[PDB]
Amino acid sequence: QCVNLTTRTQLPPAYTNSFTRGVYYPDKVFRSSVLHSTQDLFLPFFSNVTWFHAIHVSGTNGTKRFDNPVLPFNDGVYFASTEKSNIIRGWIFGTTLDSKTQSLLIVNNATNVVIKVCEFQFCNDPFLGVYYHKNNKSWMESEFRVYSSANNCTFEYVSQPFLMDLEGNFKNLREFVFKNIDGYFKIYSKHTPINLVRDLPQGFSALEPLVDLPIGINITRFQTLLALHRSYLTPGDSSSGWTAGAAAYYVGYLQPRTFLLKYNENGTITDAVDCALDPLSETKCTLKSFTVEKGIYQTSNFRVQPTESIVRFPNITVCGPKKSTNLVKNKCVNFNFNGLTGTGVLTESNKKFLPFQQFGRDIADTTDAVRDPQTLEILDITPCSFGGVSVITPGTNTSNQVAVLYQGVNCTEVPVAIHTWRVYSTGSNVFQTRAGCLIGAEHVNNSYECDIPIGAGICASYQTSQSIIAYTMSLG
């Protein structure tokens, strides 16, 4: 059945960040000595994962309590566990975790492994006991208190017998990337042995798939089953558990991103580069290499997006006259004047329309001026700004600092118009050129024979205040 423990008290958790972890084999092919660009669900590089200690001591006395809160599930979960006594045992998945909706269950029962999908009646605090005493023969007698009952189960599984917990720093890492797509339960998994650690360390480990489960249920929330080393009837304070819950687990949530994976000759994924993390990483992804030489490279195109859409049909009459809400100017918006649709910034114009004219076209391809139906103020439209983005870098293996040149635009509009990496536009390092706006480089009055040609008589170079400087080229 079920047993009620004490309240979780909503403890404020520490956080840690996963330095380049949790990339798995996306496809089912064998690729050797290739650099492949894969767009799929991955855990972002250098992302914050939240880590729970298995058993926390709210006081050093021995006041020990579980940390197994229910957590969301949006398009996959990277779950790592660092532990040495199989204190974590499995997971439940579902939407409501009650009798209303189907629920899936993976758990290690002592020695066997059982997977089910039923209408389990999960209570609030599932736990698996394993206590011992020297007298008689107990040696982890156990209690299995996960679900009250199960009805008309569809998927069944059991495995074979095995071993249990111990009645010492070789903590093992176990990583899983549970994702549910197309009514499946892709469980990418990998075990590794590590020693002399306290948290999850920086490292790289490609994860290989383990099993696909044909399940086909709606999944939104999941929990974690923890092995208890005690008994609620006679709960001990200290040394009852495993060193005050040093074993712990980390949760992070996948996002749809593009990665550059480096398959070595053997077909084993060795390195990865996250495109959307840095300007330098986008340069690597566009050049399809892990090292880039000195120069400037055009990565992508920056375009101002229309903020809000406005309409302006109101002729005033006949048929059904409509309304236009309001009118906004000096702002890049989507506009529909009497059915003429487009995007642009509307501004007050000094052109003088003849009384019988509606719109003008000085360029012969685009109507640069328009007459407003409500008030006869004549508005000229200008296309929202855009331009290429060039990444100025010295040698990739000299330094990882780069500068960014937005070509052919003023940069009173760069930080907000575009939505990846963020600039924050420090006041001193947004030097303006004729060729565009420069971000991440300072100004130097001195002149040198110019290394990297930026344009309009400005060239940039590297000096050990940002490491990259821009100056006006000298002729000798």
Epitope: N17, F19, F46, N48, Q202, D278, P279, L280, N400, Q401, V402, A403, W421, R422, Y424, T426, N429, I439, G440, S465, Q466, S467
Partner: nanobody, 113 residues
Framework: VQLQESGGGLVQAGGSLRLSCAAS????????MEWYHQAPGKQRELVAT???????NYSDSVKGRFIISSDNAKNSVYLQMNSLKDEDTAVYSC????????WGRGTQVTVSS
Amino acid sequence: VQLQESGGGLVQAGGSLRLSCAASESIFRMELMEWYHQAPGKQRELVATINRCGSTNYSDSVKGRFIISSDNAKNSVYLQMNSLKDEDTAVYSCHARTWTSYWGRGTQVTVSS
């Protein structure tokens, strides 16, 4: 934004103070960040530095009095001063270098002796 610090002012010799250079961008993506100080009439000199892995370094006049730390619950890097002398009167600045370097404006610290 602004990587701003919040702490400083007038202190008494042998006192203590806390600095809270705090960032909106994630602390872990920094990959290296430090504190420097500019003394009145003296060129700027490094105080202390911490990188992403965990290595921590100080200059000679820094060890044993104030150490560096960063609690991963509010993104911030901490430098609590202990037993200040009159010669630590300076302007303290925190720097954090992502793909480009980011700078704060520092804070005045003056010890009365």
